[PDB]
Amino acid sequence: GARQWQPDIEWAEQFSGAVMYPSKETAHWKPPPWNDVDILKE
Amino acid sequence: KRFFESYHEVPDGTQCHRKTYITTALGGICGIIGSAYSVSLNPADSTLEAVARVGRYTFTAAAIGAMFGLTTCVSAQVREKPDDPLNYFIGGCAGGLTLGARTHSYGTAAMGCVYMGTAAALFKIGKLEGWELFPTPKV
Amino acid sequence: LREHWVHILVPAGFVFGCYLDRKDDEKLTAFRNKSMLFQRELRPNEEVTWK
Amino acid sequence: MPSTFFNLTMAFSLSLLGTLMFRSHLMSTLLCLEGMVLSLFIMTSVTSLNSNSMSSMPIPITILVFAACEAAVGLALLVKVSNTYGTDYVQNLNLLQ
Amino acid sequence: MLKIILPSLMLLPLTWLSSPKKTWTNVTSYSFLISLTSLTLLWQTDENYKNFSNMFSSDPLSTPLIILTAWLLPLMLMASQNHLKKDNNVLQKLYISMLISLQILLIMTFSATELIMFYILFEATLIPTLIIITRWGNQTERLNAGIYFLFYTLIGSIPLLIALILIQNHVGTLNLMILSFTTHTLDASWSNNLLWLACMMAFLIKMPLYGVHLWLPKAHVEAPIAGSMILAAILLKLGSYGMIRISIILDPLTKYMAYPFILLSLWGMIMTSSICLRQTDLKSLIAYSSVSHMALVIASIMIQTPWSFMGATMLMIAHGLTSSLLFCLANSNYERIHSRTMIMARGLQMVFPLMATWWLMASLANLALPPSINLMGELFITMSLFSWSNFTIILMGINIIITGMYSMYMIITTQRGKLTNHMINLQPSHTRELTLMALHMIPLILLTTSPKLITGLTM
Amino acid sequence: FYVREPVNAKPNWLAVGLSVGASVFMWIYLIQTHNEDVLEYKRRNGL
Amino acid sequence: MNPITLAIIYFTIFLGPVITMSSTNLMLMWVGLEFSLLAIIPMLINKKNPRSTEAATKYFVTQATASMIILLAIVLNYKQLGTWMFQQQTNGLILNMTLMALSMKLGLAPFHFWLPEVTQGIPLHMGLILLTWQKIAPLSILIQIYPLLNSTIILMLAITSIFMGAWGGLNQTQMRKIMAYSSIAHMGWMLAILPYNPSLTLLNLMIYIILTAPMFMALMLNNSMTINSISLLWNKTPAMLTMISLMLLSLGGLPPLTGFLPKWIIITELMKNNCLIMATLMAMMALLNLFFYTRLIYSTSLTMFPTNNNSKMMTHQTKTKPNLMFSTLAIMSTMTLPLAPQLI
Amino acid sequence: RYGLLAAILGDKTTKKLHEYSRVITVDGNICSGKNKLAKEIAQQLGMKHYPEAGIQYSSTTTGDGRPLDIEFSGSCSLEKFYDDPKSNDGNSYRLQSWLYASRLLQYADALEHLLSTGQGVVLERSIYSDFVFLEAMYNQGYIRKQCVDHYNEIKRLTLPEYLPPHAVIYIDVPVPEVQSRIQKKGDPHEMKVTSAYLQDIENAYKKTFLPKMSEMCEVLVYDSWEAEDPTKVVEDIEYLKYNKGPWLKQDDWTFHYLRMLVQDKTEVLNYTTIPVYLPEITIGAHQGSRIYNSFRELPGRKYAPGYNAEVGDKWIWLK
Amino acid sequence: LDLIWLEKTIPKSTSTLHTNMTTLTTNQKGLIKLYFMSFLINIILIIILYSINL
Amino acid sequence: QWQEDPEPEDENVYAKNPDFHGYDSDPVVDVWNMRAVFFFGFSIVLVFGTTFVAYVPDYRMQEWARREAERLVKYREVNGLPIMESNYFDPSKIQLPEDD
Numbered sequence A: 001g002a003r004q005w006q007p008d009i010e011w012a013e014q015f016s017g018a019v020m021y022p023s024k025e026t027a028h029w030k031p032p033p034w035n036d037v038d039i040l041k042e
Numbered sequence B: 001k002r003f004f005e006s007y008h009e010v011p012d013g014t015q016c017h018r019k020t021y022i023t024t025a026l027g028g029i030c031g032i033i034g035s036a037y038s039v040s041l042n043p044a045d046s047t048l049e050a051v052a053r054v055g056r057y058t059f060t061a062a063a064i065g066a067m068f069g070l071t072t073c074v075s076a077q078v079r080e081k082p083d084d085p086l087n088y089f090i091g092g093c094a095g096g097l098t099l100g101a102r103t104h105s106y107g108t109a110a111m112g113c114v115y116m117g118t119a120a121a122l123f124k125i126g127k128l129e130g131w132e133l134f135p136t137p138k139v
Numbered sequence C: 001l002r003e004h005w006v007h008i009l010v011p012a013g014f015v016f017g018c019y020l021d022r023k024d025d026e027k028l029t030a031f032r033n034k035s036m037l038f039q040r041e042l043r044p045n046e047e048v049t050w051k
Numbered sequence D: 001m002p003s004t005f006f007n008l009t010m011a012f013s014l015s016l017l018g019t020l021m022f023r024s025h026l027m028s029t030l031l032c033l034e035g036m037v038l039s040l041f042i043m044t045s046v047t048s049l050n051s052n053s054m055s056s057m058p059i060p061i062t063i064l065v066f067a068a069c070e071a072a073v074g075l076a077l078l079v080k081v082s083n084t085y086g087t088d089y090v091q092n093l094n095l096l097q
Numbered sequence E: 001m002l003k004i005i006l007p008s009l010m011l012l013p014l015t016w017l018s019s020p021k022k023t024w025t026n027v028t029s030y031s032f033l034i035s036l037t038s039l040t041l042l043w044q045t046d047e048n049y050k051n052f053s054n055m056f057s058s059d060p061l062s063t064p065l066i067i068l069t070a071w072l073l074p075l076m077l078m079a080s081q082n083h084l085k086k087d088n089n090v091l092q093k094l095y096i097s098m099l100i101s102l103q104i105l106l107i108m109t110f111s112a113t114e115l116i117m118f119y120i121l122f123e124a125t126l127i128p129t130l131i132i133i134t135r136w137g138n139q140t141e142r143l144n145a146g147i148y149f150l151f152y153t154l155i156g157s158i159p160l161l162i163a164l165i166l167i168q169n170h171v172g173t174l175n176l177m178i179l180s181f182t183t184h185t186l187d188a189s190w191s192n193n194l195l196w197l198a199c200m201m202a203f204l205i206k207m208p209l210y211g212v213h214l215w216l217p218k219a220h221v222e223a224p225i226a227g228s229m230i231l232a233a234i235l236l237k238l239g240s241y242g243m244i245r246i247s248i249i250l251d252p253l254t255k256y257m258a259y260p261f262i263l264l265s266l267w268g269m270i271m272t273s274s275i276c277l278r279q280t281d282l283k284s285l286i287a288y289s290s291v292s293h294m295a296l297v298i299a300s301i302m303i304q305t306p307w308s309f310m311g312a313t314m315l316m317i318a319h320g321l322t323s324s325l326l327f328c329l330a331n332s333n334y335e336r337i338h339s340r341t342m343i344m345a346r347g348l349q350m351v352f353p354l355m356a357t358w359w360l361m362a363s364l365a366n367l368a369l370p371p372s373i374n375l376m377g378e379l380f381i382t383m384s385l386f387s388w389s390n391f392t393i394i395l396m397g398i399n400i401i402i403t404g405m406y407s408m409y410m411i412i413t414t415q416r417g418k419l420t421n422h423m424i425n426l427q428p429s430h431t432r433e434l435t436l437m438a439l440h441m442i443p444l445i446l447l448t449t450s451p452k453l454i455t456g457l458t459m
Numbered sequence F: 001f002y003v004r005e006p007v008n009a010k011p012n013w014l015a016v017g018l019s020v021g022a023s024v025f026m027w028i029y030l031i032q033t034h035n036e037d038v039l040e041y042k043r044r045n046g047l
Numbered sequence G: 001m002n003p004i005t006l007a008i009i010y011f012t013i014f015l016g017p018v019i020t021m022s023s024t025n026l027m028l029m030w031v032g033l034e035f036s037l038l039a040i041i042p043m044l045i046n047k048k049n050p051r052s053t054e055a056a057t058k059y060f061v062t063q064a065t066a067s068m069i070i071l072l073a074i075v076l077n078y079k080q081l082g083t084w085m086f087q088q089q090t091n092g093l094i095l096n097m098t099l100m101a102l103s104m105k106l107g108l109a110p111f112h113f114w115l116p117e118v119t120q121g122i123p124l125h126m127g128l129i130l131l132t133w134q135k136i137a138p139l140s141i142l143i144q145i146y147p148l149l150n151s152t153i154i155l156m157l158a159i160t161s162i163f164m165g166a167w168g169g170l171n172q173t174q175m176r177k178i179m180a181y182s183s184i185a186h187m188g189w190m191l192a193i194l195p196y197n198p199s200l201t202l203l204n205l206m207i208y209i210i211l212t213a214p215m216f217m218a219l220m221l222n223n224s225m226t227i228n229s230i231s232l233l234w235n236k237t238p239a240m241l242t243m244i245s246l247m248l249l250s251l252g253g254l255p256p257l258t259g260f261l262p263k264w265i266i267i268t269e270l271m272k273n274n275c276l277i278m279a280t281l282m283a284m285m286a287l288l289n290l291f292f293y294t295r296l297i298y299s300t301s302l303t304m305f306p307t308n309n310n311s312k313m314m315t316h317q318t319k320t321k322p323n324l325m326f327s328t329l330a331i332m333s334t335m336t337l338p339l340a341p342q343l344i
Numbered sequence H: 001r002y003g004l005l006a007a008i009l010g011d012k013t014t015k016k017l018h019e020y021s022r023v024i025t026v027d028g029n030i031c032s033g034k035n036k037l038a039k040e041i042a043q044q045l046g047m048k049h050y051p052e053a054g055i056q057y058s059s060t061t062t063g064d065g066r067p068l069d070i071e072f073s074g075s076c077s078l079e080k081f082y083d084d085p086k087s088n089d090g091n092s093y094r095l096q097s098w099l100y101a102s103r104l105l106q107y108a109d110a111l112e113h114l115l116s117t118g119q120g121v122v123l124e125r126s127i128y129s130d131f132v133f134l135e136a137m138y139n140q141g142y143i144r145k146q147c148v149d150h151y152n153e154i155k156r157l158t159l160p161e162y163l164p165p166h167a168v169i170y171i172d173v174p175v176p177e178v179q180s181r182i183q184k185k186g187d188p189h190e191m192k193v194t195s196a197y198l199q200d201i202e203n204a205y206k207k208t209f210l211p212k213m214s215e216m217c218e219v220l221v222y223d224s225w226e227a228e229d230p231t232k233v234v235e236d237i238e239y240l241k242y243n244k245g246p247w248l249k250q251d252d253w254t255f256h257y258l259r260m261l262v263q264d265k266t267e268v269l270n271y272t273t274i275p276v277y278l279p280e281i282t283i284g285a286h287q288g289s290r291i292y293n294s295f296r297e298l299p300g301r302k303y304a305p306g307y308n309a310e311v312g313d314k315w316i317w318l319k
Numbered sequence I: 001l002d003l004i005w006l007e008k009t010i011p012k013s014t015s016t017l018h019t020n021m022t023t024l025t026t027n028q029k030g031l032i033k034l035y036f037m038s039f040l041i042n043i044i045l046i047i048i049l050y051s052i053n054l
Numbered sequence J: 001q002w003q004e005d006p007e008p009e010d011e012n013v014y015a016k017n018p019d020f021h022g023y024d025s026d027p028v029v030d031v032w033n034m035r036a037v038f039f040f041g042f043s044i045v046l047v048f049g050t051t052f053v054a055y056v057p058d059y060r061m062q063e064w065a066r067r068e069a070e071r072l073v074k075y076r077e078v079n080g081l082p083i084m085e086s087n088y089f090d091p092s093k094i095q096l097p098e099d100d
């Protein structure tokens, strides 16, 4: 009848983002593209 | 350099003027260096803004330098005991407090006091016990 | 030794253990009988005091 | 020579300050980088020449041969950059933040 | 001492190689016998400590523990057969092995001649424990608890590492035998006054002192029952064993460098004892009971009088057995109740008649009822503390009154009063639950008959 | 069986013979080295 | 890559460190460093993604200026001693240059900014080479010249690196950069004992190589550059969860595992030499490194993060196996401690 | 397995390629009698005709090949897709994401057959054409905007690496006539599907899929009548010139790397499992552990192919 | 004294001290000019460290 | 919302296996996991162990010292020597710092 609490989605969310402890500005930072390739072009 | 060293030569608690001056300089020097890294990286927006930051960091550091020097020297004077880590701790205690104020935070003053003072005290002990830092290889 | 090879694991450890602890003695046998409090002279037909 | 050897050394430091203080175009840097190799080549050749140490003249040139390719690699990276951004400003090289 | 150890290692092969259905009985039955081989060390018919070999030794202080460390592995494996019986057959064999390694490591740490062998094995025990607490911990907060348990011990540990390497250079060997028969007298400098703190602080941390004990309440709360038993019975006492063997050196400084801790502990004993008085989580109350009854020990391993030391040795072995008993019965209520709250589950004796007798005897062991080693222990620490300063009785006198109050409150609001109306009906007691208890108390009754065996090095 | 057969179903018999045979060459060199060694040690020293 | 080119490059990336190590004429040591610089740049841009060109252009400029500074030291020596190699007499500033320069190529301390960024834009594979077969070369040059370098600077770069590495790592969530940061830290310990006992530098390196090489081939087995990515390891390949746990705690100094020995003997050697100031502060923040190592432990092993439904699809398909090296380098690394005396 | 050793010593894809060797996909609405054309074209050039990707296509692909239980195959129902659109649990998105993974496996298996054997490939609808179902689903209430972004992110990450279809065929029949085609085939789930939803599917192809691919590959539009006449369509394929497209630059030393990718299924869909936690996609640790700890216990799956004795593997003690 | 004062002082403070220190040291533009200058500063200080301790 | 299992109830193992001993669900393993635990637990550790521990002879010499005292007290009293002389290490052996 017990479920050692496995982490939910929210616990997981924090580890996303390009910096763990986001700063006020560094918060704006966005995780780098998984493919290691960026969208910029012009 | 013969200068900074002078701080140590005269017995502690004596010639506070020199002590405070020397301590103030070291802090200020650190201020410049610290501001420099702070400006080189995390640059400013305008030259003036950065000149200000250099000033801010320099003064704050110079202040922590002064109060450390002044408090430790005087604490020793008033207490009459020249060799005592406690003198320095009171000094480091004060130094942290100045940092706390400049940063407008009581909390920082807390950590500042404890951490900074402890460090300074250890310096006194270090000198008293002849601890060697950055020693030459003697294996 | 079939289906009982998992019951003779721990017991075997004991034996090996005892084999080593009596081997450690063999190494630390200086002062075999050269200690001051217990330095008796060898009784007839006895090889060494403590083995 | 002792006097001159100074000028060349400060030339290398002035070239040092250059490559360690970027400003816009990279090709400037690589160009500066090369200013050092010239200063090193000149100093190595000068002392070898006034030490009459002919056994070492090979080095003044090995320095240039390696430095040339080094620069070749450097420029191919540069061409690669103004093919991906087309402006070669040290300014846009910040994706890795 | 490689029979208490090699046969132990072989347990690991048995937990893995054995059938999924028969894995539990092979492991529990065999370590019961492993405990029987452990009893041979008790045969000391002379004062000379028994130096089995260069690295492995057992003296009066270690022997009473090595036997307890070997004894609890059987019990730990019997208390965790329920939870951990819902696992995948490879999570079990990991838990069983983790428990096995703890006593392998703990048996060696308590039976180690070289102090740094203690350190390497000492700080290794965290790996098995952190896995037991974090991987199988029921609550959301065990990740946090694990962090607290690793950092408080680790930050204390690196100073000891520097200190022991330091004495090796100063004296030339970390061998407890020699260090004892050699002249190591610190010189009351400012630096030595730091060495002393470096060596004692790591031991003082895992022996919760009032200042750094927050790790233990958090750790035992979410830890599984087997981890909580290990932390209270053997893990915390690792700190005490260390303080006894390390203060052989640093002989002069503790005369005056102890006041800070002694006062921290005795005032700490009162406050830790008191907050037990109103704490809603039962596992929480037992944990603070553990802090207070261990605060007495750091105040006897510092006064350093013969009686203190064996008061300490008596209490550590005794409180170890009692605490587990309390943590084990707390779990039995937790599994049927499904909540740690003390207020729920009132009246159990009405429905679980015997477990209540075990609860009563555990509480009487918790408070100092007299024909118990628990009381002999406190009576002795109390005596020496009085010798240190007659005033100490006041503070060690507020603790006795408070200790009586919380010990009986656990019995009064958990095992008496009207029954809870209809919590999930409470299934009757398993025979395992009751034995796991009987196995804790029957040894407590037997040891109280002949206290000499657990009296320490001093006497 | 498998729709996509394993690549390992019947043993790579080379991998056995260079794995088995290699190990038996190791021992016969190792055990040889020891006894040979013991001798060199004995004669080089007193015995 | 036309397999021929692959050979030429790889040979150079391998002739590069080897010439450095074998030669004594410093010049020949410099060109060994130069080749390594030329050989690594092509591989770095193999994907040729926009991030990559940035990586190489940074790595190259940082590497090139340092290479030029190392050459200047050799050129200056040539005039202070006719020899082409550092000697007892060498002017102190001449050696300090070589320390700074070589500490840039190795990326230690206040020059630690390039490494984390190039480790972020290169593949996991070329990440390993950039971290471990490119540190051998410069370190060789330092280890050879140890008797002559300054104890003060090294220590400052050592301590700084330890701190920068640790602090940097705490915030990072990208794995490539967590490793880059760890390498900065370990590199720090290595350079701390160089002035005192070079032989231990070579142990604190090998162990780092025997620890990092398994760790990265683990990160790429599932090619996860995110902790979230490595956290779903339990579904993609469950067995590596056990050893990934021990290797990362081994990378930090926890006592039962092999990783303690490098820190333990470095501390023993520094205390033997009396740096009980420096050694203490290093060991303390070394403990910060384990915090971020264990935070990853939490996500990957001790706690099971939620996974996407398509993960079931990847399970179905046979998982291409991890090379044997993983095992042999995971065990020799996680548990050799019982054999420390012979290692040192 | 294929490796640079093999590439260095012969084994080049270039010498295994022939005119009939191309990647040809035929895409249509839910009901274009597409199946027949493909098998027909396949029969024409001996092309290995790959069937339309299915929920259990991956299970048929791996090991025994017997169909897996629904929860083992990601718990996706096309059946439930239709009867419960805009479902609370989102079976429709999970169905679409599994479908994209299945065609990713199918396309990669197809490319592996193409570069190894050299036989050309017919795979019906492709990953490139999969988007039309999602576009239509977002057009109506089936999927929400982020759901779309998550699919697009997976598509952008994995699809570019694989080379484009050589040519694409378009068997088009009008929105109304497919629904009557739907009406007579027997399943009731296919019946009662939104006419507007079918409107959005074919519109998405005409608006985006055919023009886009009209440069990347030789699109061959065919009306229903041209269809059902495999001969004619087959003729036209044999008629088009395979020139325009990225395939032109595939030198042998370039194909090798592509081959080694498709050769590794675990990578083909590496980015299909990216840790983006949208709620429908998430297994969940407790359910996922049980599903894995159950899928892994199926006979022949506990251990790697060749090593599980249950199905009759032998020689394990020497493998 | 338990909970807040003995958790804010020792266990939590050390948590914060670091957290804040990582935030400043790791908030980097990523631009090369900035980073490089810092190399300049370093060379300068080390030049001095040798100079003053000549 | 994400997919996860519905709370698993805890079974009343006492509903089937009404003789449940608490060790395992299937009955024979339970019986054989208490028939071996009460036995190896109580029957040959608490009994054989206490027997052996009780018979450890003169533990830590405290059975020897109550006789050695008796012959020392017998010998010291009859020969008139002080029962516990006041210095143990003889004063003659000690070489006290002479000046101080």
Ligand SMILES: CCCCCCCCCCCCCCCCCC(=O)OC[C@H](COP(=O)(O)OCCN)OC(=O)CCCCCCCCCCCCCCCCC
Pocket: E088, E090, E091, E094, E097, E098, E101, E104, E105, E124, E127, E128, E131, E135, G238, G239, G241, G242, G245, G246, G256, G301, G302, H293
């Ligand atoms: C000095 C002591 C140091 C510490 C020793 C004890 C801790 C060992 C390290 C544990 C670190 C990982 C902790 C969390 C592990 C989680 C494992 C898990 O989640 O289960 C899945 C995993 C792989 O699964 P698989 O074997 O493929 O089959 C089952 C599929 N569900 O299942 C497995 O991984 C099974 C194999 C696990 C490894 C077995 C290790 C057994 C314990 C080793 C103890 C060694 C004691 C040495 C004492 C020395 C004394 C001098």
Ligand SMILES: Nc1ncnc2c1ncn2[C@@H]1O[C@H](COP(=O)(O)OP(=O)(O)O)[C@@H](O)[C@H]1O
Pocket: H029, H030, H031, H032, H033, H034, H035, H036, H052, H078, H081, H095, H096, H099, H124, H130, H133, H134, H190
């Ligand atoms: N991405 C998708 N989303 C939903 N359904 C899909 C998707 N891809 C294919 N389908 C299903 O495939 C069916 C069409 O296949 P069908 O034409 O019957 O196969 P065949 O080619 O054998 O005739 C449609 O009913 C449609 O629901």
